[PDB]
């Protein structure tokens, strides 16, 4: 489903444990509303592509992380494979977040 991260230590394993898988990330605050408006479908997601790893950085808590990885909005969806950032954009829009989980693997 979802692994919450909450270092940048724990996000780097997460990309080296990944190995070859697509790595989807949403950078989410709690509080902003097109994030909990997605958070129920990311999940979603999450079970329909179930060899696609599925992370979640709050950005309040982690502001380190959500500094380094240069979010300026919420939801910012980030996509990894082999620890290499392959796709981006922002926004609750599903079908953008569906069709970019297909597009890049």
Request: charged letters at 30%; proline letters at 3%.
């Amino acid at each position: 489903m979802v692994k919450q991260i909450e270092s940048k230590t724990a996000f780097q394993e997460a990309l080296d444990a990944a190995g070859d898988k697509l790595v989807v990330v949403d950078f989410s605050a709690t509080w902003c509303g097109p994030c909990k408006m997605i958070k129920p479908f990311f999940h979603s997601l999450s079970e329909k592509y179930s060899n696609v790893i599925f992370l979640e950085v709050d950005v309040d808590d982690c502001q380190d992380v959500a500094s380094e990885s240069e979010v300026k909005s919420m939801p910012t969806f980030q996509f990894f494979k082999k620890g290499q950032k392959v796709g981006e954009f922002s926004g609750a829009n599903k079908e953008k977040l569906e069709a970019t989980i297909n597009e890049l693997v």
